[PDB]
Amino acid sequence: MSQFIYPVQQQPSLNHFTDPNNTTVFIGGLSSLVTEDELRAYFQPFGTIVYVKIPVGKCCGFVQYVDRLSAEAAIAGMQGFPIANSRVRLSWGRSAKQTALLQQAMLSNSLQVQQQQPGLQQPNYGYIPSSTCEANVSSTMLPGCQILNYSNPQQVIMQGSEAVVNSTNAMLNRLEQGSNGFMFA
Amino acid sequence: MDKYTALIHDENFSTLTLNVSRYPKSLAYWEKLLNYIVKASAPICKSTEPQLLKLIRCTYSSMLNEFPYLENYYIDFALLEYKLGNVSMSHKIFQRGLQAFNQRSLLLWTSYLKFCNNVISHQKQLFKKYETAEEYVGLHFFSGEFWDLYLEQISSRCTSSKKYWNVLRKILEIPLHSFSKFYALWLQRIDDIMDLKQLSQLTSKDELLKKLKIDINYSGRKGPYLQDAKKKLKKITKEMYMVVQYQVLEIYSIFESKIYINYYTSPETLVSSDEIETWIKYLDYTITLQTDSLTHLNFQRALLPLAHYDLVWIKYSKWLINSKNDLLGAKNVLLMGLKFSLKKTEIIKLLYSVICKLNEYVLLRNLLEKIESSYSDNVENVDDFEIFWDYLQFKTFCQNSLYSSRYSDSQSNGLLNKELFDKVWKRLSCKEKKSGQEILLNNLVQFYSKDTVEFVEKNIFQKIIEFGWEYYLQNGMFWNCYCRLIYFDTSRSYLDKRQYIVRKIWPQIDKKFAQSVLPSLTEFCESYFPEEMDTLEEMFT
Amino acid sequence: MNYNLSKYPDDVSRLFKPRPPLSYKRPTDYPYAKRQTNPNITGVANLLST
RNA sequence: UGGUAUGUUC
RNA sequence: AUACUUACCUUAAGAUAUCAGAGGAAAGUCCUACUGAUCAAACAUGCGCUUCCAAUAGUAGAAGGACGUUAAGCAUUUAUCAUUGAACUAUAAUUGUUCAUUGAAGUCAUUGAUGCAAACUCCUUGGUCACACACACAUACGGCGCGGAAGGCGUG
């Protein structure tokens, strides 16, 4: 036979660490004084967030981004940052239903098998990953512009030129209003 | 008539030329126009019409000004100029094409060296071109074909054969896609060693004696001593292979399996989101590894599918700013990114701030003059507000620094300068056609001094009152900004400002507008005047 | 050597791979237009007297 | 009385 | 392989050592397992012929390379032509000097080229033979061990 052959390798068995599609972030070490909106305000600018939830009393939370890129920017950006006087340990975690399935498999100790988080269905042309929109469009769809984006919660909206106004506009709102106390987050 | 005039009186040449001239950036028009010109020369020879050849050279060179990253057409214009006979112009076309890519391109270096081989005929200089090519493009993941070119030139030309070992030992450490082939060449080329002195080809004498315990000057029976030596060097190669195989299989499995498009297409092509994500992650990996030749090569290698986006022009600029500590480098990256990218607003913002850090304010004045000149001295009327607002902030910085202040306590008059205030009023006067009205009011509010508050109150608040513009009067943010202008005056006392807001301002707004104004105005009132919150509620019900 | 103008197959024509191209050296003789034997061959009649 | 070459048939 | 089909060809002549002598088919020709002399080739074979054939008692050396490194070594020297405008020096049509414009060609090089010189590293090649570790020589030097390489000369 020939001296050059293609390499072959074993699969690494699919937990939440070895899933390439996993976009949810386990934040651990939460301070129990921090709400879901206050944590959303921390993890918002890294991407668009499918959902943010905090288990009652369990001193940990989850943030589920839309992209893998956004989530890795989150884990690199906010690692050991003190959210309300307690340093925060970030890692990959699973969802809510997947966690319920792992706990019911942990009681019966039967299998503990995970399944893979869904992917977008490549190729997508409009989407530039890790890019956020806050709120009559005639788009020419030329490439530098961002034709498509995810609506904040959930829907698919086309970004425009006008949105760089709206974010700035909303920004001045939470500099003023949140200063007086009407949103702590 | 000749073949040129038969070409120039063709009906098609008019439409093809004219479509290119209408739509310069669309490139299917340029390719149809160029293919038609070249095909209407049935045989390109040294006697074909010199007017027609001059027309061909003008067409390709203008296309390579419009689209400077098309590698295949730099090669094709060089080969056409070769066929016509002058190898000097083909040299200059290859070097022009290498210059468009900052020397960092594998296809142009590969083709320029396969060309150069035939026509240099000076050996030191031919090899110095391979040593120049290797520092720019030699660490490319697909750069195996370059190293094949360099090794076949060495193995034909050199008589000594030490240069082959010295090149191949370097190639053994690069994590190339085709890394094994050069391991197989080293293994065969070790296996054919026929005595002890040849082992000084591999490394030095002292390293063999000290590290591997081989004596080349061993006099004795030399057969089994040589077999032992070859077994030891085959082991040390096995460990080096094992390292490089880990590198290459990691890079392939995460990143290079995922990228499908490696070449520039046209300013109108889109890239899938998957490839944008893996290019961003693959650049992050490269920046971690800290090989600067390879980081520059990978940014240049990444600009090919997505030159026209701007996320990598920004990213490459940021890497030069904070990881290499180089601001003139980052200015040159962003400045070149103006040429390519279609969006340009985030690049101009970041480039203004890079220049301001580099203390080069005259260049900032020239870029502000070119942006006001690009909109015909009429940036106030631009549809996209981000251009006007970034322009206006940095123009205000230059203007406060250029003209001394007119108001007390050295309070630099930002938007209250007759050059800038006229632009701001001219954009405020369009009322709904333009986009950024509340941001502009909300920054005009921020002056907080008696002389400044009086000017801002009289010129934009009283005047939009007396003109009766319904857009501003029904809008809650107008009244909120006006109350917030007066309330944060450091001059006026508390009873004075509460007296002014409740007694003078709040009657002026119409009662038809209450359903539009009361959400915002309440939000002022509860924030600062809880006591007067009855009065407001009584005034509008 | 991408192509073959010869009758042989490709493997046979790779065997006839030439040496590298010749280097250039400046000439030490006369350029082809300046070559001539002797002109100004002087006359034979001067001998005949003396 | 020949040679080399070509292609078909078996 | 056969066979068949076509297509392309089917030719410069002459000679085989020289000179002299005897014979055969007055001038010449031809020939003589005829005879002298010269020449040339092969093969044997010799010359007190001439030159050359590497430490191991040591880590060398000789011959020839490098299309090898130091090396951007050290020292010199090179990088277009025409047209038009502008300032400019001036004995001057504006000769000199600088800036831009149109056209024409244009090996790459300037880390080059050329001059000089040195160190270092490495390749190929050889009887790395035998007996010796020795007081020689004016006719200056036993050329009086076996081979090998190359020529010079002589004989058969």
Swiss-Prot record, chain A:
Q: Where is the RRM domain?
A: 23-95
* Record remark: domains: The RNA binding domains RRM2 and RRM3 are required for NAM8 meiotic function. Within the U1 snRNP complex, the RRM2 domain of NAM8 is positioned to bind to the intronic region immediately down-stream of nucleotide +13.
Q: What organism is recorded for this protein?
A: Saccharomyces cerevisiae (strain ATCC 204508 / S288c)
User: Which span of the parent protein is shown here?
Assistant: 291 to 523 of 523
Where are the annotated coiled coils located? none
Q: What is this protein called?
A: Protein NAM8
Record's miscellaneous remark: Present with 1480 molecules/cell in log phase SD medium.
Null-mutant phenotype, please?
Affects the meiotic recombination and the formation of viable spores.
The gene for this chain is NAM8
Q: Subunit info?
A: Component of the U1 small nuclear ribonucleoprotein complex (U1 snRNP).
* Functional summary from the UniProt entry: Component of the U1 small nuclear ribonucleoprotein complex (U1 snRNP) involved in the initiation of meiotic recombination. Involved in the formation of DSBs at recombination hot-spots through meiosis-specific splicing of REC107 pre-mRNA. Collaborates with MER1 to promote splicing of essential meiotic mRNAs REC10, AMA1, MER3, HFM1, SPO22 and PCH2. NAM8 interacts with the pre-mRNA downstream of the 5' splice site, in a region of non-conserved sequence and is required for efficient splicing of uncapped RNA precursor.
| Highest taxon in the source lineage | Eukaryota
Q: List the disulfide bonds.
A: none
UniProtKB/Swiss-Prot annotation, chain B:
Q: What is its main location?
A: nucleus
Please provide the Gene Ontology terms (biological process) for this protein: mRNA 5'-splice site recognition; mRNA splicing, via spliceosome
Q: In terms of domain of life, where is this protein from?
A: Eukaryota
Disulfide bond sites: none
What name is this protein filed under?
U1 small nuclear ribonucleoprotein component PRP42
State the HAT repeat positions.
Answer: 7-39, 51-83, 85-118, 121-156, 163-195, 255-288, 290-322, 366-397, 456-488
Q: Which Gene3D superfamilies match?
A: Tetratricopeptide repeat domain (1.25.40.10)
Subunit-level organization? Component of the 18S U1 snRNP particle, a subcomplex of the spliceosome.
Keyword Disulfide bond found:
no
UniProt motif (Nuclear localization signal) ranges: 230-235
Note from the entry: Present with 1730 molecules/cell in log phase SD medium.
Which Gene Ontology CC terms are recorded? commitment complex; nucleus; spliceosomal complex; U1 snRNP; U2-type prespliceosome
**Pfam short name (any one):** HAT_PRP39_C
Q: Which SMART domains match?
A: HAT
Residue ranges annotated as transmembrane are none
Curated annotation (Swiss-Prot), chain C:
Subcellular locations according to the entry: Nucleus
Known role: Involved in nuclear mRNA splicing.
Q: What else is known?
A: Present with 736 molecules/cell in log phase SD medium.
Subunit organization: Component of the spliceosome, where it is associated with snRNP U1. Binds stem loop I of U1 snRNA. Interacts with mRNA.
Q: What is this protein called?
A: U1 small nuclear ribonucleoprotein 70 kDa homolog
Task: Name the source organism.
Answer: Saccharomyces cerevisiae (strain ATCC 204508 / S288c)
Query: Which residues of the complete protein appear here?
Result: 1 to 50 of 300
